[PDB]
Design a protein around this ligand. Structure first.
Ligand SMILES: COc1ccc2ccc(=O)oc2c1CC=C(C)C
Ligand SMILES: COc1ccc2ccc(=O)oc2c1CC=C(C)C
Ligand SMILES: COc1ccc2ccc(=O)oc2c1CC=C(C)C
Ligand SMILES: COc1ccc2ccc(=O)oc2c1CC=C(C)C
Lengths: 608, 102, 115, 63
């Protein structure tokens, strides 16, 4: 048993001669074991039974410059012993690291020739790794490359290994794994910005894709049920998503697997067709929908700047929602006027007094029904869900107050005033929907209610400290609050200063409160400017790009299907043989670079 | 910047006058008197209204609420247009001034 | 290094690791394990932590005369260890001290003459 | 500063036996005849790429 560990030590070192003679000793052990015929006696002596690690495994852990000689001897030892398939394709037995198959290790240790010999040995190169480490619940715990030796070298930027694994016979590029992912998913899953990662995730996405040659291995969906394009949306990885939409290929026999088809070019002017296979909302899950209806990811302002999203989003405003938002704006504007006039300022022939109150009741319900479902469908109060709360609350209190008049409880009038009060509050809520005027204010209403109230929570507590102090100078306590609030106004004067007890002490506590208020009110004035400059100033139009585009698709589901069927952007076009696609046309002009053109949708440039 | 300050302050004032008349009909419901309620609430911007006019006939607890909500929100809004004019009109209107001067 | 407050040398002390085998003992920031792009490390705590009467962290705190204390605390074995001591002790300790003195001021003003 | 000032100021206020429970880091062996209390921090790098030869352990994950 010491002899086994001495081998593991000889595994751990480059002692070539010491490694050889122990195998000569182990060969003599196999000779003396006649009855076993050494199937597993070879296995038992070369492997710790608790962990499943072998001699070839542990040698690939510890890399020395004598490692290549260790490999060629270990493979020479197994081949007389005829158990190399059992030897090389051994795997881990514990639930962590589960089935690692140290061909995986040599990829991770980046040894190309050592990898080539194991391929030349034949090592089941589509070996699915498992284990809690390879599929971690947390980011700090493990590393999720997607359980594939091919995808590992892809994820670890070793393109020659990606090249060398590419032309094996039983490679099976289309493989799936635990969590249901394909090789492109993990490439999306493991990606960052141009900071901290430089374009290899893009390029290794490209390099494997040219070998593919089929629309499948993008049409596949995971166990979550998502395409790599869909998973690009849900993960929100921006830099890969730019590459997907503008993926064009000049090289002829596989120009089919391409997007952004070049329509025509005539010198500095060209036109192009961006594909709409799954971007537009004609399908239940679309690219544009997932980017809108998620708050948890990040960075939604960046992704919407990208081109086939950006123009298509602009067109849907122009043909639908600029009419739709202005119409919704005018109806609720008439609704608030309809509330306040017939409150008490104004029943047989008086039709328009009665039909006016009827018009209030019918429209407030449909808002309350639609918002009541929508709130029940769903973090939230930071953006737009607190707003959709107030629309529902204001609608109910209109309905609730009139129903108090039916049961004649006297608070029907008082609840009616609160309903009309919040009716103008939601009238302020449409002011963000203009391009400019609400949006610098509304997102800073998020900020100015935060920063001034924390000053006011100081200041009201700063108020009541001085208030009980002067009340001790001889409800009168509530009157002392009202007296000291006049000092903020300036209404208190010299004659009220003529105290009964200690005029010298009463003269001190006044002027200390005056100056410190001038200290504090100047301080929040200064500190708001230095903090909210250029950060809240930019984040304002960020949410303006959000909450507009939020509502645009929210208007889109409100339209009927037959009227949607008229308004379909883009057009059915033929980019290749036996293919017909709806695509979006965008004209543009470049001047800087200059190239002759070989890829054409048409010969004739102009619109026919 | 008279081109600019008439644009940016009036859109605040078109909010604020509409922000005025919403509170104006609310306190008028607390018992032309409607035009007098505008003149009463404009005194609050001046500071002329005081404690004795607060002694309402109906619901003093509700009349105490609608005053102080208008005071703070006015201090919110008038501070907001003060901040937003500085961050927007810096260095762009400041350069475009001498452009038109040329 | 702490008392003089020389920052640039102090970064070299804490992350002083050596790959060269026969003297890898005289090293700090021991590499735990690495698997591709993910690695773990062990920063030593020979004299940094306050288990000894004079420690590195103590001298950086309890001096005003030197300079530049914001720079030195950005350094790594200080920075994480300082963050952990907030989380396991002082966020409970400061909030508890905050609530007692908050109750204390209310306890002062009420029984002044109101009751 | 003043946060981290008070943190160590709270530290001396604690008793020794309760401090003895809360000891950050762990006793580990980095070399022969050496045992040290050290702090573990995980991190991720992408830019440079090197094969690894210096190891505390062969097995990456927490056991
Ligand atoms: C009005 O159309 C919209 C609407 C929303 C967004 C949101 C993000 C964005 O970056 O772009 C957008 C556009 C395009 C604007 C123009 C001037 C072509
Ligand atoms: C165009 O109609 C609109 C417009 C705007 C809104 C705003 C919020 C909302 O929840 O509902 C709305 C509706 C639906 C009302 C009807 C009568 C179908
Ligand atoms: C709350 O933990 C603290 C406390 C104090 C300091 C002081 C200096 C410093 O630069 O870093 C600090 C941290 C670390 C914060 C995080 C979020 C890891
Ligand atoms: C946790 O206890 C606290 C909390 C906060 C402070 C603040 C300043 C101070 O000088 O002393 C303090 C103490 C010690 C009091 C006791 C009863 C042991």
């Amino acid at each position: 048993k010491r002899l086994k560990k001495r081998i593991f030590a000889a595994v751990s070192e480059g002692c070539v001669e010491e490694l050889r003679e122990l195998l000569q000793d182990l060969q003599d052990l196999c000779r003396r074991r006649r009855g076993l015929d050494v199937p597993d006696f070879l296995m038992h002596k070369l492997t710790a039974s608790d962990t499943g690690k072998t001699c070839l495994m542990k040698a690939l852990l510890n890399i020395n410059p004598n490692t290549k000689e260790i490999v060629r001897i270990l493979l020479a030892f197994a081949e007389e012993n005829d158990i190399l398939d059992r030897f090389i394709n051994a795997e881990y037995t514990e639930e962590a690291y589960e089935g690692q198959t140290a061909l995986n290790i040599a990829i991770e240790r980046r040894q190309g020739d050592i990898t080539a010999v194991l391929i030349a040995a034949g090592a089941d190169v589509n070996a699915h790794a498992k284990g809690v480490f390879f599929n971690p619940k947390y980011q700090h715990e493990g590393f999720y490359f997607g359980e594939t030796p091919l995808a590992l070298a892809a994820c670890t930027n070793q393109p020659e290994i990606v090249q060398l694994l590419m032309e094996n016979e039983q490679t099976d590029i289309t493989s799936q794994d635990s969590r249901g992912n394909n090789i492109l998913h993990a490439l999306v899953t493991v990606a960052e910005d141009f900071k901290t990662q430089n374009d290899f995730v893009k390029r290794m996405y490209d390099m494997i894709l040219l070998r593919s040659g089929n629309w499948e291995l993008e049409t596949m969906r995971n166990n979550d049920g998502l395409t790599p394009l869909q998973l690009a949306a849900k993960m929100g990885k921006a830099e890969i998503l730019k590459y997907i939409l503008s993926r064009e290929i000049k090289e002829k026999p596989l120009r089919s697997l391409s997007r952004k088809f070049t329509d025509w070019a005539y010198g500095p002017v060209s036109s192009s067709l961006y594909d709409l296979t799954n971007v537009d909302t004609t399908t239940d899950n679309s690219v544009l929908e997932i980017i809108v209806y998620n708050t948890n990811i990040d960075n939604r302002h960046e992704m919407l700047t990208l081109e086939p999203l950006h123009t298509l989003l602009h067109t849907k405003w122009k043909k639908f929602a600029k009419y739709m938002f202005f119409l919704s704006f005018c109806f609720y504007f008439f609704y608030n006027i309809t509330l306040t006039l017939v409150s008490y300022y104004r029943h047989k022939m008086s039709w328009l007094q009665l039909l006016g109150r009827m018009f209030v009741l019918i429209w407030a319900t449909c808002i309350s029904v639609k918002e009541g479902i929508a709130i029940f469908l769903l973090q939230s109060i930071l953006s737009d869900a607190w707003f959709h709360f107030v629309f529902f609350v204001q609608a109910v209190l209109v309905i609730l107050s009139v129903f108090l008049y039916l049961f004649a409880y006297k608070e029907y009038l008082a609840c009616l005033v609160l309903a009309m009060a919040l009716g103008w509050a939601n009238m302020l809520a449409y002011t963000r929907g203009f391009q400019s005027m609400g949006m610098y204010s509304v997102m800073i209403q998020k900020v100015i209610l935060h920063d001034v109230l924390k000053f006011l929570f100081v200041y009201i507590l700063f108020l009541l400290g001085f208030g009980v102090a002067l009340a001790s100078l001889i409800g009168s306590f509530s009157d002392a609050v009202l007296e000291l609030f006049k000092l903020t106004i300036g209404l208190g004067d010299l004659n009220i200063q003529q105290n009964s007890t200690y005029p010298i002490l009463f003269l001190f506590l006044l002027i200390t409160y005056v100056i410190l208020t001038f200290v504090l009110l100047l301080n929040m004035l200064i500190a708001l400017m230095g903090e909210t400059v250029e950060n809240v100033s930019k984040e304002s139009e960020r949410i303006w790009r959000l909450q507009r585009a939020r509502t645009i698709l929210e208007f889109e589901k409100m339209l009927p299907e037959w009227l949607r069927s008229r308004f379909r952007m883009g057009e059915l076009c033929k980019v290749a043989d036996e293919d017909f696609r709806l695509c979006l046309r965008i004209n543009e002009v470049k001047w800087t670079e200059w190239k002759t053109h070989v890829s054409f949708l048409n010969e004739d440039p102009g619109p026919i």
